[PDB]
Each structure stands twice: as C-alpha cells, then as structure tokens.
Symmetry: C3
Subunit: 248 residues, 3 copies
C-alpha cells in the first residue's frame, strides 16, 4: 500500500472534531484521497448516518500518493487524539505497514502507533431528500433545547412555519416549548416551503450535538415524517453531517 | 383565580437565589401580593425557618391583580430554573389554570409549565427575639469557618465579646478556632450588648451558607442558648433570612 | 522541648508543596533547625526516597531555638493545609506541648491544632551516585509523557544520547515515543557523559510528578540500571528531590 502524510495545525481542535463523530460511532472507514479525507458511518442501531468531509485545503501539508481506505477504532483514536495540545501540530502518517503513526509536534515530539483495523463497508450514500424546511441556528439554542426537552420527554417535535421554528416536548408532569423567529438572535436563517412537522429521539440528538460549540452555526433540514439532516462546517471548508431517522 | 405576570432581569441570578433556600426545603408556599413575593418555610426537621422576601422593586415588570398563594415543588422549580442563562429575562406567569408558566427570553424564547401543588401552611411567623449580639461578616469567612469546623466536629460554638467574634469547634483528634476583630477585613460590624455564647449544628449551617457568595455581606444575630438569625440581601432590597435552632 | 515559630507568606503555595510529597508518603519526620526545615522519607514500598529541603530564607519569619524533629501524619497535615487561601499567611508554631499549631492569617485568623506523632526514623541518606545523564525539562513535557505512556504500558524507558533524550513505552496494542532535542522548547539542558538507558515504573512516576507545575523546571539524573533522581526548586532556594529505584 502507498504511504501518505497529512498535517493539521491545531491538534486539540482535530481531536474535538473527531470526538463529535465518535459520540455515535465505534469504528469507521476513512477514505483518503488527493482531494481530502472522508468518513461515512452509521451508529450501531442504524438510526444515524454520519458523514465527515475534510478537504485537503484544511491541512497544512497533504501528501497522498494513491486513494486508499483505512479502518479505525474510534475510541482508541479519540484516546490518542485527546493527548494533543492546542498549539501542537498533528501529523498522521502511514508507511508500508498496517498502522497509523500519529505524531504531536510542539514543545516535544510525541509519536503513537495506532493499529489499523478492518471495517465492514456498508455501501452508504447520502441521497437527496425532498426537505421542505431549512433552519440555520446557533449551536447553543439547539443544545439548550435538547437539554430542556430531556427534562420532559424522550422525543422532540420540530415544527417549521413560514415565520417561526418551534421545538416542543411534552411529558406527563411537564411540558417545554422553544420558539424562534428571525427577530431572535438564535435563528440566523429560516426557509420553509410548507408547514413541516417531525419528531426525533432526544438520546440521539443529544449525542449528535454534544460536541458542537455554542457559537457554531448549525443547519437543519427536515420534512414531515422525514429524516433530520444536521450539518456544521469545520474550518469553513470541512463539513460534518448527521442524518437522523424520524421517530414514527 | 387571578392571573399575574412577574419579570426578573437575569434568570441565572434568580435560579441561584432559589437554590439557596431549596437547600433545606422540599416544597414551599409563595405568597404573591402587590408589594412583592414572599416565602416562609421550615426544613423537614423543623430546625430551620427560611424567610425569603422579594419586593416588587427588584422585578422589571410586576403585574399582580389580587393576592394569592401558590405551592411549589422546590426541586422541580430549581431544575427548571437551572436552565436559565445569565443574560436571559425570566418571566413567571399564571393564567387561569393550576400551573406556573416559566419563560426564559434571550437568544430564544423557552417556556416550561410547572404544575402547582398544595403546600400545608404551618402558621409561621418570624417573632422578635432578645438577641444580644449582631455580627456582619463577609460570606467567605463564614463559609470557610463552617468548612474548617466540619473537619473537627458536628457543632460550632459562636462566641461574641465586645471586641471579638469567635467561632470554635473541637473534636477528639483536632480543634479549630476562627477569630475576628474589627481590625480584620472579614468583620464589617460587631455590636455586642453582653458576652454571648451559643452552639449550632454544622450540617444545617453548611446547607444555609452553601449558596451564599464569597463577597456577600451576611448579618448574624444570636443570643445565649437562643436561635441564630442569618440574613443577606438580594439586589439591595430583597432579603433571605434563616432562623436556626440552637444545639442544646 | 523548645518552642519555634515559622511563618510562610502564601499558604496555598505551601499546601501545594506539601501535597507533592504527600502523594507517596503517609507520615514523615520533619527536622527543624536554625538553617531551615528538612524532611526525608520513603514510600511504603521503599521504592521512592523523598527529600524536601526548605531553607530559612523562604520563610518571612523563622524563630527556632534548638534543633528538633517532629513527626506528622501527612494526610491530616494536607487536609488542614488545603484550607489555606492564596493570600493567607501561614504560621506553624510549637509551644511546650505535643501538637503543632497551624494558623492562617488573612481576612480572619483561623487556628488548627494538629497532634504530633512518632515516626520511625529509618537512617536515610541521599548518597552520591555515578549518574551519566542529566536532563532539564519543562514539567509539562514530563507530565504529558508519563500520561501518554500510561495509555500503553506500566514502565517507561529513559534513553539519553549526546543529542537527544527519549522516553519510550510499548505494549501489545500500542506504542508511544517522546523525543526531545535542544532544538525543542521542552528541553532546557542535556548533559550526557555516555549513552544511558534505564526503565522506571509509571505508577511511581505519575505520583512523583502529579503536583509538579507545567512551567516548573525539573532536573532528571539517571544512569544505566541506576535510580532516577528528580528534583525541582521551591521559591528558588527550596528543593524537592525524589530518588526512584529502577525497573529491573
């Protein structure tokens, strides 16, 4: 197999990015091409599809000789990546053997070897879906709404109308409603082709947003009784996308 | 029953205030009048009386049509109030039904409904007591003294003389003494009509001061073998008062 | 026995210093002389020798009438010292009786009495050893290397060559290497008489460095199959030294 070397400036930020996807994934195939690194995976229950796309432009050095796929234990990977410091440079390097060499370069050079595994490749595509609502909002609104709703229920209803986005949860001894209009600072954009209603499991939503930052911009696309698509951008050009089955 | 709407600027600070009283209380009757909101309660052991007085002037909007009392599960209330952010506006609103509508307004509008309960109203008054010592001190001195004493014993002796306030605890394998004179920055005022000695349970004192801030000014009034009265002010005009039975 | 009074400006910093040695020690004899305070102890397994030297110059007041030794329960001592604040002045005073009086003076005067114990005095000396490598490095490099290695193994190999210092750990499902040259900011000095290799237990190293600060300068001296000597300086003139048996 051909070697590659991939360098990212800011190892803690790369660790944070990986921890977001690792919240639902145990293992993942990473496709390394000359245009960038991509990773598509499902959670063990097949309720959530994760798609992480890291184009070559976000790496300070990108040397990939031929396309290849590597399989990675995500919790081992996250354990090593959690050792990187904010100011560290991260180097991912594969030689001829079956392991990833992970180097942090900062006040010292620290090198880990991570054994590569074989990951069964479900043939996962991200199809195009007839979404009828798009919502852009601040991560902290989304995070707090999912936490608020968890005080009440295990499912969260999303309601998009022309002028307002509403998340609503109700239980026996409680109820909670989170409402956004474009007058609110939490809602950066709202495009609604028609009145759209759908519900989603809170345990999955919490794991999806746990690593998202309070100032991150998150785009939601959904439809009536359709999956929820949730993405946010990494370093302007990278992108993390979740696709979440509806609660029906 | 008549509706009311009550608005407080700074929801996290209102949550903090409620958590202080919630440390000893499971449930409480809130008397809502046109002059403000008051709450008088005892802990389950009847050792501590709590009196919280929130005058209308600390609320940015105060619309109370007729006096009424509502009963509240304090741990449910604290759970909801803990979701408010520092910059949020808090709205407490009762309509015609038997629930409190709690709204946080900030980057988004989040609304919870809290079921109102029935709280047995012990006829609690805050009588006037012939205290012989008054002490004003910084919260952190009081907090650290109670923590220091807990390393040693389960009761804390308060000793007020004309020129010094002393808190003293002794156990078998330890002893601790905390001494204040007006020369010390921790003691803002000391008025002692006669030499005064009394002891109090540390487990109650710790729960009383847990939510008090390090820079808060706390007034203590006590007498020989008498209850301890402890109060501090909320937004200059609100007031939280504890009355604690002596250890005899 | 003769009284003494010893005053240290900055009680939290004295607590931190004591907690470093307390990580491996349960009890210790403190020799109080006119030149300063010293403490030599071994961990319960006799794998680590600890030597703490606090010269009279680091104390704002130092009144010792005649040399004497006192025995101290280190976990009781640390428990009391943890109550001191950053701005507090710490006073250690022995009168005629068999207890240490520990006073924190700040916003208030708080006084604890700590019973003195009898500590069996192993006749411990810090002999001179034919070390062949000396390494000065930033504490955070050392701390992170020991943490990195603990992901992999229970022993850490130290390798000193003329131009590089290497710490290396290997396990079955992992390996880690930390490399320093004088080009690196983590390595402040490297003196190597000959190529030196030795290994040490990670559980002991972690307890040795747990209290060391990220910006502290740490000196390591070791030899092939010899003990590791690790010291850093307290207030320029105090010194904490560990001597750690090799893993053979």
């Amino acid at each position: 197999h051909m070697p590659f070397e991939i360098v990212f400036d800011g190892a803690k930020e790369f660790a944070d990015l990986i921890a977001t996807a690792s919240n639902l994934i145990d293992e993942a195939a990473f496709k390394i091409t000359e245009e960038g690194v991509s990773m598509r995976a499902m959670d063990p229950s097949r309720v959530v599809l994760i798609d992480l796309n890291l184009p070559e432009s976000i790496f300070s050095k990108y040397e990939v000789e031929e396309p290849e796929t590597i399989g990675i234990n995500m919790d081992h990977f996250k354990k090593i990546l959690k050792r990187g410091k904010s100011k560290d440079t991260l180097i991912l390097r594969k030689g001829d053997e079956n392991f990833l060499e992970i180097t942090f370069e900062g006040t010292a050079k620290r090198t880990f070897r991570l054994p590569l595994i074989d990951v069964e490749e479900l043939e996962l595509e991200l199809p195009e879906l007839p979404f009828t609502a798009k919502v852009v909002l601040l991560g902290e609104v989304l995070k707090e709404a999912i936490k608020d709703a968890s005080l009440v229920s295990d499912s969260l209803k999303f309601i998009a109308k022309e002028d307002e986005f509403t998340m609503k949860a109700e239980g026996e001894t409680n109820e909670v409603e989170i409402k956004l209009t474009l007058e609110d600072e939490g809602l950066l954009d709202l495009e609604v082709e028609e009145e759209t209603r759908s519900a989603y499991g809170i345990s999955y939503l919490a794991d999806m947003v746990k690593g998202i930052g309070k100032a991150d911009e998150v785009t939601l696309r959904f439809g009536t009784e359709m999956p929820l698509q949730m993405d946010y951008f990494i370093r302007d050009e990278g992108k993390l996308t979740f696709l979440l089955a509806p609660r029906v």
